[PDB]
Structures are given as structure tokens and as C-alpha cells.
Amino acid sequence: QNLKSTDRAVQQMLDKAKREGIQTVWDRYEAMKPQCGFGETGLCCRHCLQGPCRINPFGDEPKVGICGATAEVIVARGLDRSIAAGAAGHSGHAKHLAHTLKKAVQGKAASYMIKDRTKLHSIAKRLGIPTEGQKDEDIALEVAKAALADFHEKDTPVLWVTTVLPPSRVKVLSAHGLIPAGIDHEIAEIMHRTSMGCDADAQNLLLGGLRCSLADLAGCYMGTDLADILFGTPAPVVTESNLGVLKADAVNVAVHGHNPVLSDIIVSVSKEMENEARAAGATGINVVGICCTGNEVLMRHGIPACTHSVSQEMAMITGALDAMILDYQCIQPSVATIAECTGTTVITTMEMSKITGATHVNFAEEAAVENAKQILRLAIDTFKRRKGKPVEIPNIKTKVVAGFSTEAIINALSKLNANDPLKPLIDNVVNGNIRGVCLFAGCNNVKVPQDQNFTTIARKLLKQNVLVVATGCGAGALMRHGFMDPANVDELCGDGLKAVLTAIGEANGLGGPLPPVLHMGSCVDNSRAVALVAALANRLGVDLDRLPVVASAAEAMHEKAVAIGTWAVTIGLPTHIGVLPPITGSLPVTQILTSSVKDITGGYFIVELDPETAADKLLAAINERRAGLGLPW
Amino acid sequence: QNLKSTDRAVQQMLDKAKREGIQTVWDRYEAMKPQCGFGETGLCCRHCLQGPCRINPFGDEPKVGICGATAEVIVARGLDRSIAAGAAGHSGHAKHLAHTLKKAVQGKAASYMIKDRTKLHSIAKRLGIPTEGQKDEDIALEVAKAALADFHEKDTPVLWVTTVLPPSRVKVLSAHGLIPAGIDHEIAEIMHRTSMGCDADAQNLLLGGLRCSLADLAGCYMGTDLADILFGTPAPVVTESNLGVLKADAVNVAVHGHNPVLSDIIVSVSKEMENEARAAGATGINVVGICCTGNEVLMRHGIPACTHSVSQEMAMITGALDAMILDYQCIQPSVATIAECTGTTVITTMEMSKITGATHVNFAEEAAVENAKQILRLAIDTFKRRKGKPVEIPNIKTKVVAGFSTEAIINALSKLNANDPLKPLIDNVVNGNIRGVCLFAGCNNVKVPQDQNFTTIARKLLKQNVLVVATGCGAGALMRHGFMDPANVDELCGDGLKAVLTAIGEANGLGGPLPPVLHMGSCVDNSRAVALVAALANRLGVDLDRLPVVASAAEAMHEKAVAIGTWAVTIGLPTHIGVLPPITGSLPVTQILTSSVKDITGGYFIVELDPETAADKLLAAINERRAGLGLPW
Ligand code: SF4
Ligand code: SF4
Ligand code: FES
Ligand code: FES
Ligand SMILES: [Fe+3]
Ligand SMILES: [Fe+3]
């Protein structure tokens, strides 16, 4: 089971699933082998009813699609649709939050409120919305209206792109036609241009994809901004992760999916229902996180993370998961059938994300508290049904320090330099104590032994003094292996990085260092890394493609991760992907994405499946940036 | 070559292409056989980087996707994405026109103007925009703003759905949650809900698809409305079709693609350049149509149609096509390589639709006339390059009577009953002279011998007194085989239908009948058929699912045709599709689309690849509706 996952708790539950005959994601993967090579390489098109069309990677016919579409066109169109799909998921997430904020300040959803007034005013200022002499509710109404306006064409471009990157970066992007006109406008344009008999030039198609990736960035940044207004900006917090956070004697409730509009209320309501849970024989309600919505409540409330991504089914195999509360994205639909075996009540809540065989409880922001109590009462009932049933919770957990929003990072640094908080970080990049920065992002993928790329790459980079930040299920992988526990700084970190983490921590009164990896939040919170990198660029007077900053989607899976990787390239970063995207069937497309895009945006993809080699390539990219700034490396 | 196309002119050019070694769409199809059965049946998913996933239609594993997605989910998600892609193509088309109208009345594009003031005021009235005491330019600005507003969420639903169907139909759709909130909003929601780990319930997915299909309907109806304002509402016109409309001694210029914003200006400018063409040794500029934009200029100006859809490459094989002017959609990208063999200058004009190897001339509405002259001068240069080169134009053409907008049909009927124009049509349905109405729509498809389904089905229905209307490349197929020539009424039409066509024609002063099939225009102009059917429903006080009206996408190909077929079902029509959509791998999905959707919308798909059988099934559907109204059949 070590071929399947490097997580020991997951290995234990894989053994239980095997002896119980419960099929898992790894079993479904094995049954799919060998996978179709046309799809793997990108050389398949089903964009019209003359297909399916395929192209042999090598050899004889077929060499071209029925309509004449070349390998270049087919590969680029498929990639563009993935970017648009990722942007759409983030469109749905951010748009949800914008509607929630609007309703809240219109008096239509009293369970929600302006929790971070400071962030509200700073967003309004960034967007040009006047605040002096205005009621907070009116400022927030204007912010929500501005958010919704960025989904369509108007007399301004998407402000959640143009106001969040430095002017010089916006100028480079505008010169290449890459600034999005509206989030849903670009998604639709992608679907149009990639439909049969439309765009058929690889460079033109890929430029469209870069522009749609910025629409995805806008949705991410909008999601983070709105969630911080509504639920609070994260600050440092200490919690735990892995399956050992489940408690046999409690009602265990997992929040899984994406949006804090749902998971944040579940957290607060669960506290008010503790007595009702005790009357049912439990110690209380133990809310635990899966995937991004788990990250959201971990960052803001210290809710412990149960598991992530590929291993999500294993939480159910323990026998102790009384409910799994879902909204949308990254939920394996197998959970609905596994629940019949394990006793778990799987509950969907969003109209556009149902699963056959799961119970559906419409969640309306307007009735959030009452909907949450209905959901949690189903969980309590389920806990009662397992009275006296043995459970197998692996007694395995790590300590996790998290909550490093960009505001929190700036505040931590300000303890070393109050009025120039970014300077201590830059000073230590210059003197070599920090070699550079690497953002780990994205998913696990069943093709890769779970977490193996993230931990292998992270270990090499940390020993070379790289400051490592992480989001999403990359943060999940690193947290579940101790990379967010400051007790592991000595073992993991190079001397220079240890010195800096220690200096910052001691200045924040910790008597100890910051953790080896800084958790910057959920996948939309990749936007927080953008805010940090843009702030550094602005402080230095250079563009992002001159900074020693890289990204790694080391085990990528979802269309959202392709979108994120593409905007990382578009804003100027060397961006590693540790699984093969469906591009290898076209050398011209691969050459654009890994090489000639450098001349457009300064960023580029690094496709590398071997993690030791990927680490060397990321270090080379960092050191090339250092040399470009005239620094030793 | 009779296995390839039933069009004799196409057969002749296929022989020429063969002896010249020029590969065609039919050759590329042969090279693709056998096509992938997983894709054919819909049992393939590439929505994340764990794939490609496939499911065996029958037998052993794989039985389920890696994430747990069932065959039902995989099939429904693939279908939904096709609907969204079709809606997007129509979003791009209608949105283009909305921006053109706005610019025109803001003084930013003087080549464009309000040509149909009557239609402008009637659209404004339908939308609730006040006209009394208002300048036309201001009414048009408000109409264009309303069009653009329907792309996103607002305090009203999509008005180009809710104001174009009868209230009772809107009520049925609203009761099932099917009214779209915004055109691009629904496209994005589809891409979100079908992404990995989101919607995983076939019924829920398919309801989303029906709603997105209404977003497609809105884009179609918006496109027709705006094009009629800008370029005039069609009225009856007489022209010709097939390759014999090319003229060896003229500069032959094909307009190909979709939007009249481009093709309409080319038509007018070409007239002003006749002398400049004569100086180059030509008789003039002979503009001819391919595909929908050809239909647009045929309907409004009587421009002859050269060819359509699958046989588009054959226009170039003649050696006489000096230019092919493209905008977007349904253009085989092979045209760019064939042009090097044939001498044709292929010219793209839209930023989001380029083809490697073609010349690109940006077309800006703001400079339309100057851009058109640049394009036409490239064509003149090309004509000069072929001085003394022999050409092979098949001397094959048909006579085509067309221009039957819904306004024109109502006007024709009003000659029999001035103040109740629909009543003569209803009277003849009741007395059996008209059995029912069938709309032929959509593409040719290389899998089907070109035109064979359209003509086989049409012949049977016409002999059974069905009133036949047609759009797009269904109109193209029927026109190229004489179905729009009134001289063929005696041969093709049953006695009752002949009587009605004759009575209407004689009342319109023709001394002869209307043609056997009424050409209602381009693919967006399927919306004209909706207007006619809705007007009949309103006049009768019944919903559309009680009327003896059916549709047939007899040779469907494009994602747009899937979208159209789906909204035909959603508005209440029995809808035949003559090629297999990728649904057969899920019996539950097939059963919803062909049977249980009847209980939701009253419409349903009829999947039938044998055209004689399809005709019998369409007649049965018509006659079942007649029986439901208490009529003999
Ligand atoms: S769009 Fe072209 S390559 Fe794709 S399925 Fe249709 S004919 Fe084949
Ligand atoms: S979404 Fe599910 S079925 Fe589709 S490729 Fe990914 S794992 Fe396979
Ligand atoms: S041929 Fe396998 S993905 Fe299409
Ligand atoms: S396996 Fe052939 S279409 Fe995917
Ligand atoms: Fe996520
Ligand atoms: Fe068309």
C-alpha cells in the first residue's frame, strides 16, 4: 500500500478497505490500466459528431482530424477547455460569495456579516470605491456589485486582475492582448473558439488560454477577498491533521468541497448543538476538514484536517465518520456508494452539485442556521446508529501551524522592521539565507504515490534554504507529513532558512521558529501568494518575472489546477507540473508552453514527473533568477 | 462518389480532387476508421488528469471512472459540455451583433445603421422598452444594452427566453427550474458542474443542460433580432444554388462562416468595386455564399449559395474561387492547406478565429468599408494570377426561392385573411390539407452520404402533406436538390399541401405556388421557426407541446446543432436526430432524453439513423399530436 500512498493512516485504511471488499480510487485506477494513449497525449477530439477523432503520436494514419484539425490545434483546444472549466469552478465559487455578501448587507441573510471591516475598506480602496463618509453596508454593497460586474463585459477590464498586479505586469499583459474582459465572457469565448471550425492556430488558441487563466486568477482573488470580508482574514493558528483527529466518542462531521459560505456556519452552529449531541450519547460534535473547505475552516478556526484529495474515501473506512457535508468540486462521487457500506450520511447542499444516492438538503444563505441544524441532526442520528459498533481510527496525526495569510506574513515580518515589513525578507534573499520562494499548489493524483512528489521536492528545496509556502492539497500533503510542525525545523531546513524562521518566530514571541512550510490557505488562496509576490515586486521596482519565485503543482489533477498553473506562468513564474498534462502529442504546443511563452510573459512550464529531477529544475530556475538580479547563488 | 455525396456537383469535384491528389474530408474520414467506440458511445472522460477514463459498453472492467463517475454521469457531463459549447458559439455571434448595433448608434461605426425601424420598435415593445417620444438611436441603444444584459445575472431572467415563448410555456419551464439566469452565466455553470467532483446525478445534470439549451435559444433569437434591425428583415427572394453559380470570368468571392456584420458589408462594397474588378480583366465581383453567412446574404440580398457544410472544400477544387472570406464556426481548417493547391486566398477576419497558413485581415466594424476593400483587393489580385488557367466549374445549379422570415410568412398568409393571418394555416391543418409542420435544421455529417437523410425524409413528409420549413445547412441540402423551386411542387407535394401552397402563391400574385420547402434562414434563424410556432400556440390558446410540429436535425454535426436539438425538446417538440449523439453508452440517459423528458417539457428526442424509418417516426409524432387535438389523421 506504500505504492499507493505515503500516508501511514491511509495505508492502514487501505488494508481495512481491502479485507472488507470496499473498492477504492486506487482499485478503480488499476482497473483502468492501460489507459488510452490518444487521450494521455492529447491527440483525441470529440468536439463534433463526426468524431471521435484521434491522431497517432507516431507512425501512419490517422495523422489529422476529419475536419482538418492538426495535432497542434487539437491539443491546444483541449487544453483551453480545461482552463475554461477551471476558471468556471472558481467563477461559481467567487460568485456564490459575492451573492452571499450582497444578501447579508441587504438584510436578507442575517447569519452572515462583515467580520473584517479593515479588509473591506482596503478592497474598496484598491478598486477605487469611496469609503469616507459611507456606511460599511453601502461600501460592501458596492464591493459586491463590483465583484459581480467583473463577470461580464463593461467599460473597464476585470478589476480583480488589473488592480492586483503591478502596473508594469498589467502593461506586458495588455500589450499581448491578455487582460480578460469579463470572467464568464472569457469562459464562453474559449468554448466558442475551440468549437468545430473556429480557431485553428496553436499560438492564437494558447494566447486565449492565457487570458482565460487570468479570468481564473480573478475568481480566485475575488473568492479570497470576499471570504475574508465575511469570515475573517486568517492569522496564525495551531491544530492537527490526519485521520487520528477523528474521535470515536464524538459525532464526527466532515466538511468537504469548497465554499466557506457553508463550512463556516457548520462550524459555529455545531458549537451551539453540543448539548443536543451529548443528549444523544456523544461527547460533542467534532467537525473535521477535507479538501479546500477544510482548509478554509482550518485557516480561520483551527478546525483539524482529516484528509485530502485522493485519500478522501479513507475517512469513511474508519467507521467513525457520521456525516460528510458537501458543496462542490473535488468530491469523488464514489463517496455516495461507500457510505452504504460504512454508515456515513453523505449530504449534498448545492443545487448544481448532487450525487445519486446521497441525501440532499438545500442550503440557502437566507436560512443558513436552520439548514445547518437540519444537517447536523442527521449526523447525530447517524452517530446513535453506530452505538457499540467498533471503529478503526488510525492513531496517527501531526501538529499543524497554519493561518499564514499575506496580512499575517507581513505582520510577522513587521516585528523585525515595523515600517518596511518586506525588507527583512528581501535582506535575507540578498544575503542568501533565503535562496528563493516556492509555492506548492494543487492536488494529489492517483497516478503518483500520494504525497511523494510534494515531500520529495519540498525536502530538497528546504535543505537549499528555499522559503516554501503551500495551499490546497499541496498544503494538505505537507501538513500530514509534519512540514507545518516547527519541531521539525532542525531536521528539514538549511542553516540559513532556519536562521530566518527562528529570527521571525523569536520576534513574534514564540520562543521558537515559524514552521518549515507556511500554509497560505485554500486553492483560491493561491491568490494570497500572488498578493505577496506582487507586493515584493512593487517594493523592489521590478516585475514578477525577475523575482526568484517558482510554483509547483507537483501532483496535479483537477481542471482548476491546470488553470492555476497557467496563470502562474502568465504572471511570470517558472511553474512545475509533476503529472503529464495532455500536451505531449504536439511538440509545437509543448515548445510554446515550456519555452517560447518565456518571451511573452516571462513564465514557463517545467514538465517533470521525476521529483528529484523536478527539484533540481526548480532550483535552477530560482538560481537563474538570482543571477539575473546580480546575486550570488 | 455517390456513397460520399448525393450532390452531382460535389461528385464531379470529388473526381477532380482524387486525380489531383488533394485530400478531402471524406478521405480524412476513411483514414480515421474504425473510430473509437468509447467516444462514439459517450463512455470516455478526460475531465481531469487522472484520466483518460473509459467504460466498456458491455463486458468486464473498466465499469466506472477512476473518481467513481458512473456511465450515467460521464455521458451526461459530456453532453452538457457540448450544449454549453453550442450556446457559446451563439453567445459570440449575438454579442458581436449587439456591440455592432451599439457602436452604430453611438456614431462609432457609420457603415452600419438601423435598416428595419419597424423591427426595432417591435423588439423594444416586446422587451418593455418605451418608444413613444424617443429617438430611434436611443431605442436602439436601450435594445443593445438589454441584449448585453442578458449575458449575466440581473434582477430579471434572460428576456430573450421569457419574452419570446408564451406565458404558459414559461410557467412550465420555471416550475422545473429551467429558465436561464444569464447566457454566459449558464455556460460557465455547465463547465463548473461537469468538472471533476461536482454534479454526479444524471437527472440533475440533464436539467442543467436543458436550461443551458435555452441560453442557446436566447442567443439565436437575439442574433436574428439584431441582424434584422441592422441588415433588414428577409422577404421573398429568387436566386440560385450549387457550384454552377461560380463564374470563370468573374472574381469569385465566397463569404463563409456566420456573422452578417461581415458578409453584409462585403456584399455592398463589392458592388462599388465592380469597375476596379473590370480594370483587372474580370466581369465584376461575384459574391457567393457558403454555410450560414451565405444563408444570411441569400435571405436578405439573393446572393447565390455555392455550397454548404461537409462539401465546402469542393468550391476551391473548381480552380475558380479567388477568395474565401471567413469569420467563425463550421470552417474546415483544411481550407488553409487546400488553398495552396487551388490558388484560393483564404482570409480570416476575427481575432478569436485564425487558421495557420491563412492571411489575416482584422475586420473592425469601425472601419468595415476600408477593411472590406483591402480584402476584396486581395481577391482581385488572385483572379489576375489565374488568367489563362482552365477551371472546372460543374455546370450544375438549382433555382431557389427563399426569404421566408416569419414576418414574410405572416404577410403571405395575410393575403388570404388580412386581420387573422394565422387562421388560413390553422384552417388547413384542421381540414387535413396540412398534416403538420416539420423544421429541418443543422448540418451535413461525413458519416452520412451528403444530403441523403434530408431529402429522403423530406420527400416522404411532403407526400403526406407536411408543411416543411428549413434553416442552415438543412436548407442548403434541400435547396441544392430543387426543394426550393416551385416548379417541383407537382412532383414533390401531396395534393392537400399543393392546394395550400398554390392558394397562398396565387393570392400573392405569383401565378404559381410557394416552393415545396420554406427557407427560414440561417441557424440562428431557427429562432424564426420558434416565433412562428409560438404565434400559432398563442393564437390557439395551447402550449407548443400540443401542436403538430416536429424538428429534424437529420445529419447533425456541430455542438451548435446539439444545443438547437436540445432546446427544440425543451420548448416542447418531438426532435429527430439522424446521427448518433454520444449517449448510447448509458441507457438511463438515453431513456431520459427519448422518453421521460416528455413528462418535463412535452418534447423528446427521436434517435434514428435510417431515414425512411425516421420519416415514419416523425409522421407518427405529428399524427399523435393531431389526435391529441381531436383531429383526423
Ligand atoms: S472538431 Fe474536427 S477533429 Fe474534432 S471531432 Fe469534429 S471533425 Fe474530428
Ligand atoms: S473526472 Fe473522473 S471519470 Fe473523468 S477523467 Fe477524472 S477520474 Fe476519470
Ligand atoms: S481515443 Fe481514447 S481518449 Fe479518445
Ligand atoms: S478512449 Fe477513445 S474517445 Fe477516449
Ligand atoms: Fe480545492
Ligand atoms: Fe451555421
Swiss-Prot record, chains A, B:
- What EC number(s) has UniProt assigned to this enzyme? 1.2.7.4
Task: Show the GO MF annotations.
Answer: 4 iron, 4 sulfur cluster binding; anaerobic carbon-monoxide dehydrogenase activity; hydroxylamine reductase activity; nickel cation binding; peroxidase activity
Name where it mostly resides: cytoplasm
User: Which cofactors are reported in the record for this sequence?
Assistant: [4Fe-4S] cluster; [Ni-4Fe-5S] cluster
Question: Per UniProt, where does [4Fe-4S] cluster 2 bind?
Answer: 45, 48, 53, 67
Single Gene Ontology BP annotation = generation of precursor metabolites and energy
Respond yes or no to whether keyword Transport is given for this record. Answer: no
Q: Give the Pfam families listed for this entry.
A: Prismane
Q: Under which main EC class is this enzyme filed?
A: oxidoreductase
Superkingdom to which the source organism belongs: Bacteria
Keyword Aminoacyl-tRNA synthetase attached: no
Question: Which segments of the protein form a coiled coil according to its record?
Answer: none
Which Gene3D superfamilies does the UniProt record give?
1.20.1270.30, 3.40.50.2030
Which SUPFAM superfamilies does the UniProt record give?
Answer: Prismane protein-like
Q: Where in the cell is it found?
A: Cytoplasm; Cell membrane
Tell me the CDD domains matching this sequence: CODH
> Could you tell me what the cofactor note in this record states?
Binds 3 [4Fe-4S] clusters per homodimer.
Residues given in the record as [4Fe-4S] cluster 1 binding sites:
36, 44
Recorded topology in the membrane: Peripheral membrane protein
- InterPro entries referenced in this protein's UniProt entry, alphabetically: CO_DH_a-bundle, CODH, HCP/CODH, Prismane-like_a/b-sand, Prismane-like_sf
What family is this? Answer: Belongs to the Ni-containing carbon monoxide dehydrogenase family.
UniProt comment concerning the protein's domains: Cluster B is an all-cysteinyl-liganded 4Fe-4S cluster; cluster C is a mixed Ni-Fe-S cluster which is the active site of CO oxidation. Cluster D is also an all-cysteinyl-liganded 4Fe-4S cluster that bridges the two subunits of the CODH dimer.
Q: What NCBIfam families does the record point to? A: CO_DH_cata
Kindly provide the name given to this protein in its UniProt entry: Carbon monoxide dehydrogenase 2
State the organism of origin.
Answer: Carboxydothermus hydrogenoformans (strain ATCC BAA-161 / DSM 6008 / Z-2901)
The major lineage groups are: Bacteria, Bacillati, Bacillota, Clostridia, Thermoanaerobacterales
